[PDB]
Design a protein around this ligand. Structure first.
Ligand SMILES: Nc1ncnc2c1ncn2[C@@H]1O[C@H](COP(=O)(O)OP(=O)(O)OP(=O)(O)O)[C@@H](O)[C@H]1O
Ligand SMILES: Nc1ncnc2c1ncn2[C@@H]1O[C@H](COP(=O)(O)OP(=O)(O)O)[C@@H](O)[C@H]1O
Ligand SMILES: Nc1ncnc2c1ncn2[C@@H]1O[C@H](COP(=O)(O)OP(=O)(O)O)[C@@H](O)[C@H]1O
Ligand SMILES: Nc1ncnc2c1ncn2[C@@H]1O[C@H](COP(=O)(O)OP(=O)(O)O)[C@@H](O)[C@H]1O
Lengths: 13, 531, 531
């Protein structure tokens, strides 16, 4: 997703 | 909560994109740089008025790119013996080098590397020399990018701006109305905002509000709402009912102190041609002087010409010269800078924070731009005159930088200005026209209600040869009379509009600003020069 | 003798309420802030003249809240420096965090963060940074608050006023008569006071006494009483007879001096229009000018008409240019402030403890306020004029701050001050007329123990050409003659009154302090302005 990140929506921001 | 993406900033699309490219291309895709065969840029110097979001922007880019981010403060590392600070700096650079890709954020670089003229301590020179050596020593292969932040871009050693150093400069000026609205929206993404709000009106009213001031205003509004709701006191009816109100924002606006306007800075403009009252011949002459070259560079290059960077206005005061300058700056979509009286007189006396060199360099960096000097004769001292002469002679070929001056006494000013390579273009402000005065009155009365189809022709034909300021003074006098009448009626808005009596009273009390003898002398001088 | 409750604070109810509301809510009731979704403020900065009870107020609020209190002096941190500076602050912050709720109370914060200029230290820079970083780092849930205290609000880096630092400012001024009475009552709780106590009169006469000075006065009164009682001096009979008397307080006043009135401070006023008679039209005009926007700001903003807060008074000296300003301030219930001509001269020479910038900052922080510039033309000064102009231009019309300048020579007052958006409104103050003079004599004579049988017309007619000061001088000379007669009769209280003979002698011996030529010139200039 974003913020170099990869309940799910909060985790992926 | 210590992570913020590009979505957490607003009003800086141009600067945001500049930083994005200049700090992601060298890191994300270094291969193309070697494919062309150049050394990718390393230094990046972002500067702006304090509290404009420099640190937040740097943190946002560093966190979003997901790159190694070594952070170095200013005074923290500066307050120590030469061995310790060099130790600190060398360790920072080595750590950034070892774990690539790396970004070094040397915050408050001004304290580390100030100007030698006033601060010549050996410690500063040693630190600057080591910093330069480290900056040049970075390997091309290594993905290291250095970012520095400061509030006075001209208050650092010039050596840091040479090629191979902090060459690419970025200027973060005051956010515009759209920028202010975006900032307000960003900050007000969690408050229990009430339905009634005027965010657009808040943006319109807030002038010279940097992001920090906007955040402070939002916090103050929330505190005011809490204070208002504290009288009833925990009940969930109180908790859910809590919500900010536009009146809270107005109170906060009344109880805040913006500080951006304190010193000279770069501001946008939005004035248009129709805002002026006419004088189309002077508009066309000025267009030929300034704007047409920008839109027809090929013709000038073919036939062979260069833009005449500089025009001096003279005439009666309060004739809309500032409006003309703002309109001209707007028509070229260029930022506008102004200096008025004390702004330059303080530098003339030396007690100030910005020099003429500072403003000129800012204008160059934010090019294209228009710099306007009001009451230019106010200094006609020798030092500032010489500095202005040198800067004007230092005009760029095709950078579109233009300088305009305001002065009603051209003779007093040093004749050195009116020579080739300088403000050889002279423009006189003629008398306002009846149609121009009527249009000005209508524009000033866009919001104030009056008689439907009010008879202003009588006033326009009665006000012949009067300066622009007379129209505004008359309008204010009539408005004051109308407010007084409404207050008297209420105490003793049934008459929202205004009849002719207020204007008649204003005319009886009103007097011309420009004297007949002075106007005659100005016209005679203008005609003699024209001859 | 700690654990002093609110009972040990008087004369500063508003400031105490502000501090209580701003401290208890973050600590005792933080759930509201998370409900509305904002980080509760931490940055509180209270400043005031030395010995005004700042430390005592902080101690009292901390003890009443029951939160772990901690103190970090200035000299203590500056007496060690080296490696103890940062460690002490870090351990203090850790202790507060682990014992939340807690309050950190700094003293003389200027010594640890002086306002930055050419004369700037280097050691402070790291401590300040460390402090700033720690405060920002404190978690929202942690019930911690930081309070500073400096004598000069504009003597610290304006960096501590940014969002996330000490922004919530509080100003403490000289307590009023009620405040002084409350302070005296609080201190006067253990002395075996004699029945001869006139605390109300003491409060009324004591003007410009801070709480510390009042405590010193009580100490000196006790010392005087024991000095008187030393003769019989331990036997309990003498000890029981101990008790202070009004004479002791008078002696202490005669042997005690203030320490705060000299510097520019904010104080309350209670003058009313009834004090000054005549010029009713001027009163109505000034009311419409200043009060009406305050009384009805909504209508004023609806009907445009941006207020022109620069109102100047010109005319012969002693015409009452201060009572008008005091009455204006009283009407708005604002904290009136005055700056005299010697203050401006000291600023011009540069050997002045304060600057006009500091005065205007105090005015803003104490808004609403009415500032009075006495002897404005005394400067005739270009530097100070430019500074004042810049400060005025830096004042937003929305803020409820009004400025009034007094000058007897408008001819030599500087056109730059008369521009629109500035001190442009002009008013002429002539001498009082027969009715005005008689009203002044009546009101002033109220304090004097006059003798019935005053001649209204006889006193008023001959007094043509006399301003308020001349009438005051005639009254004082008549009282001096009465005192001479009384003392002569006593040596060789049959006369607690004054017969008409004293006033007749004084008025037959009087003089015109204002000449006819200057009055003619003033009226001619007034007619020229009207034309
Ligand atoms: N878009 C924005 N532009 C500017 N400030 C913003 C913006 N959004 C939020 N802010 C707030 O404004 C301030 C910007 O950050 P900060 O105070 O560090 O700025 P700065 O003056 O550049 O910092 P420093 O001089 O310490 O490096 C912070 O309070 C941030 O919360
Ligand atoms: N179309 C117009 N024609 C004449 N005067 C105008 C016009 N538009 C605005 N003005 C007046 O001219 C002012 C701008 O000129 P100003 O800055 O007062 O000149 P100066 O710098 O010589 O004092 C406006 O604020 C307004 O009072
Ligand atoms: N309401 C009050 N305002 C001011 N001072 C007060 C008040 N009540 C008591 N005092 C006494 O006045 C003196 C003020 O000194 P202190 O409290 O240390 O303040 P500062 O730190 O400004 O000197 C102390 O003796 C204090 O106890
Ligand atoms: N309406 C009035 N006009 C003039 N003097 C007055 C008026 N009412 C009272 N006075 C007396 O005149 C004095 C003028 O003193 P002050 O205000 O200091 O004068 P100035 O400001 O002109 O130096 C007042 O203190 C008061 O005693």
């Amino acid at each position: 997703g974003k913020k170099r990140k990869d309940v799910v929506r909060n985790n992926l921001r | 909560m210590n992570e913020v993406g590009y979505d957490d900033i607003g009003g800086c699309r141009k600067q945001m994109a500049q930083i994005r490219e200049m700090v992601e291309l060298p890191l994300r895709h270094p291969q193309l740089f070697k494919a062309i065969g150049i050394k990718p840029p390393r230094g990046v110097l972002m500067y702006g008025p304090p509290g404009t979001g420099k640190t937040l922007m740097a943190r946002a880019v560093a966190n979003e790119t997901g790159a190694f981010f070594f952070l170095i403060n200013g005074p923290e590392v500066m307050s120590k013996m030469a061995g310790e600070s060099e130790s600190n700096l060398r360790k920072a650079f080595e750590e950034a080098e070892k774990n690539a890709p790396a970004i070094i954020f040397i915050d408050e670089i001004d304290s580390i590397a100030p100007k030698r003229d006033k601060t010549n301590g050996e410690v500063e020179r040693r630190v600057v020399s080591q910093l330069l050596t480290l900056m040049d020593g970075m390997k091309a292969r290594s993905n290291v990018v250095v970012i520095a932040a400061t509030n006075r871009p001209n208050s650092i050693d010039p050596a840091l701006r040479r090629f191979g150093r902090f060459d690419r400069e970025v200027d973060i000026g005051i956010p515009d109305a759209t920028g202010r609205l975006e900032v307000l929206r960003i900050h007000t993404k969690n408050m229990k905002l009430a339905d009634d709000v005027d965010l657009e009106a808040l943006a319109a009213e807030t002038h010279g509000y940097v992001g920090a001031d906007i955040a402070s205003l939002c916090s103050e509004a929330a505190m005011q709402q809490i204070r208002e709701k504290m009288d009833l006191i925990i009940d969930a009816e109180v908790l859910d009912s809590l919500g900010v109100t536009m009146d809270n924002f107005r109170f906060a606006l009344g109880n805040s102190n913006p500080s951006a306007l304190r010193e000279t800075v770069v501001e946008s403009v939005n004035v248009t041609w129709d805002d002026v009252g006419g004088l189309d011949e002077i508009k066309e002459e000025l267009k030929e002087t300034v704007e047409y070259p920008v839109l027809h560079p090929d013709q000038y290059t073919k036939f062979g010409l260069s833009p005449s960077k500089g025009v001096l206005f003279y005439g009666p005061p309060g004739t809309g010269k500032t409006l003309l300058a703002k309109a001209v700056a707007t028509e070229v979509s260029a930022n506008f800078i102004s200096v008025k009286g004390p702004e330059l007189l303080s530098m003339w006396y030396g007690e100030s924070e910005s020099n003429i060199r500072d403003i000129f360099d800012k204008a160059r960096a934010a090019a294209p731009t228009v710099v306007f000097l009001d009451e230019l004769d106010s200094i006609a001292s020798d030092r500032v005159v010489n500095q202005l002469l040198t800067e004007m002679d230092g005009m760029n070929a095709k950078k579109n930088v233009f300088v305009i001056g305001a002065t009603n006494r051209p003779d007093q000013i040093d004749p050195a200005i009116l020579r080739p390579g300088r403000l050889d273009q002279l423009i006189y402000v003629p008398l306002p026209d009846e149609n121009a005065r009527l249009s000005i009155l209508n524009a000033q009365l866009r919001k104030t209600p009056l008689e439907p189809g009010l008879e202003l022709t009588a006033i326009a034909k009665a006000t012949q040869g009067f300066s622009g300021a007379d129209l505004l003074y008359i309008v204010q006098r009539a408005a004051k009379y109308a407010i007084k009448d409404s207050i008297e009626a209420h105490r003793q808005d049934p008459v929202p509009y205004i009849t002719k009596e207020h204007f008649a009273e204003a005319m009886k009390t009103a007097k011309r600003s420009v004297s007949d003898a002075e106007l005659r002398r100005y016209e005679a001088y203008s005609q003699q020069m024209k001859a």
